[PDB]
């Protein structure tokens, strides 16, 4: 059994397509509601689980918090695909550029388009894009504090070697 999100037990959380707009700790501009600064929000969960969840090859999705965790678990693999050989001062800028560049949302090019509900309206697509850009900017910034933990000029190999690993053999 792979590790599912803690937030699938949460209820009446806001939703877009069928992503969960889970509480977030961040500085980036966007629609995600502030988390408690003392608590693990979905990005501390997604970074904590990623290195275990990308070895499994069979993952049942319980609800919209797992659909969110999967998008995070896939975007960590894109970031570790980018980061090889960078200085932290370059990696911040390269992975923010990766986070902000134009991407396909579910319902548009998207790999898991079989499992994610398309946006409910022309307006739901914008609240989805402005969430997923805020999410993946924070996810990149948070990840970099782990991969450049002990030394600031060389990505720690214990994080970089998952760049070949690929959650359930899917990628963005």
């Amino acid at each position: 059994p792979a590790y599912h999100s803690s937030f699938l037990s949460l209820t009446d959380v806001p939703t877009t397509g069928n992503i969960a707009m889970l509480p977030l700790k961040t500085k980036f501009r966007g629609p995600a509601y502030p988390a408690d600064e003392s608590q693990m929000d979905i990005i501390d969960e997604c970074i904590g689980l990623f290195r275990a969840n990308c070895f499994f090859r069979n993952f049942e999705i319980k609800g919209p918090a797992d659909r969110t965790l999967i998008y995070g678990t896939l975007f960590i693999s894109e970031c570790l695909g980018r980061v090889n050989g960078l200085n932290y001062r370059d990696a911040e800028r390269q992975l923010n550029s990766l986070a902000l560049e134009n991407f396909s949302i579910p319902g548009s090019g998207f790999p898991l388009n079989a499992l994610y509900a398309p946006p409910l309206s022309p307006q739901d697509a914008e609240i989805m894009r402005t969430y997923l850009t805020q999410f993946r900017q924070e996810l990149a910034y948070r990840l970099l504090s782990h991969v450049y933990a002990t030394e600031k000029d060389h990505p720690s190999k214990w994080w970089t070697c998952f760049s070949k690993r690929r959650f359930m053999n899917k990628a963005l």
Partner: protein, 370 residues
């Protein structure tokens, strides 16, 4: 919200990021009164700027603070920046990160003091300086092409291909609207009309703005104007007297195509555009001839696109197709491009912040900007 200030040689243009045109446009001018001023206390002041200076021009000495895209007087320039923030936009600059424009091939000290004044005196949160040519590609909505930008003080070319500029193929020419205004103010003397004062400079500019046009064939327009009155036009001066103008009405803008008229050696805007294409790599030239992006207020004479397309077609090999791209919004396309750039979500990590000016001084600008 960011400010975009296209701080030009002849006109300031300013507005917020994401506005579709400048909220302010005014003469890039500062002036001091030229007379005894004996009737004191009716609201006189030590110096005048922008539209106020332009409105009182007859009693003023008028100084442009920029010469050929270089700041030639810093006190006058920071008076204009002060006037943009506290009279024309009416915003705290210390709450608005600011995008600034410069010509390519410029003194490094200009960009440094322009940076220093923003962090030391206007206390701005963050700031950026863009080479004003590449803003014309943002306004034109294209990744590729050769700009020709002709301002008040400078005319310059920049080839770009698929997002990369060719900085060896860039070139500039210190001839634009100012030097054409000087030349018109000279050649009207051939008809016996006379203009000499820093006020009368603006009257001749205001004539050049509406009478003047570009000949499609200069020897034909010369021969026809030398044998008919039908090309002549007339205009009235503020003092009440009237003038009538003939071949002078196109012999002025012809200086862009023949700089030897003002005693310059370097070649006209068609030849320099073609040489800037020929200085690029062999493969990109096909796309550059298809994307000659005109820009800046001196590129707005009637007929200039038709003349430019005729001239470059005589230089380039005829077995390919050459086009001039010249939108109605030409005059503002630098500022419009800066408004687009300042709106990009990927650009927001490129603003140079005071929190990296402090440990680096003005010198950061050359490595962080361009």
């Amino acid at each position: 919200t960011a400010l975009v200030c296209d701080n030009g040689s002849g006109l300031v243009k300013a507005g917020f990021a994401g506005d579709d045109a400048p909220r302010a446009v005014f003469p890039s001018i500062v002036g001091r009164p030229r007379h005894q001023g004996v009737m004191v206390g009716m609201g006189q002041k030590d110096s005048y700027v922008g539209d106020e200076a332009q409105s009182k021009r007859g009693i003023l000495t008028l100084k442009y603070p920029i010469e050929h895209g270089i700041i030639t007087n810093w006190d006058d320039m920071e008076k204009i920046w002060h006037h943009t923030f506290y009279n024309e936009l009416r915003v705290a600059p210390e709450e608005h990160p600011t995008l600034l424009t410069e010509a390519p091939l410029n003194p490094k000290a200009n960009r440094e003091k322009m940076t220093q004044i923003m962090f030391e005196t206007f206390n701005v949160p963050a700031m950026y300086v863009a080479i004003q040519a590449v803003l014309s590609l943002y306004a034109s909505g294209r990744t590729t092409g050769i700009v020709l930008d002709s301002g008040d003080g400078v005319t310059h070319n920049v080839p770009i291909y698929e997002g990369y500029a060719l900085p060896h193929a860039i070139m500039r020419l210190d001839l634009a609207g100012r030097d054409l205004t000087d030349y018109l103010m000279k050649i009207l003397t051939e008809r016996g009309y006379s203009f000499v004062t820093t006020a009368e400079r603006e009257i001749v500019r205001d004539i050049k703005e509406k009478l003047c046009y570009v000949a499609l064939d200069f020897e034909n327009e010369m021969a026809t104007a030398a044998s008919s009155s039908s090309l002549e036009k007339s205009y009235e001066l503020p003092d009440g007297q009237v003038i009538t103008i003939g071949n002078e009405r196109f012999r002025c803008p012809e200086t862009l195509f023949q700089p030897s008229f003002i005693g310059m050696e370097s070649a006209g805007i068609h030849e320099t555009t073609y040489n800037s294409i020929m200085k690029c790599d062999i493969d990109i030239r096909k796309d550059l001839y298809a994307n000659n992006v005109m820009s800046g207020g001196t590129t707005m004479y009637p007929g200039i696109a038709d003349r430019m397309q005729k001239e470059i077609t005589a230089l380039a090999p005829s077995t390919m197709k050459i086009k001039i791209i010249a939108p109605p919004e030409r005059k503002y396309s630098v500022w419009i491009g800066g408004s687009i750039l300042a709106s990009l979500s990927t650009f927001q990590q490129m603003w140079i912040t005071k929190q990296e000016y402090d440990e680096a001084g003005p010198s950061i600008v050359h490595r962080k900007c361009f």
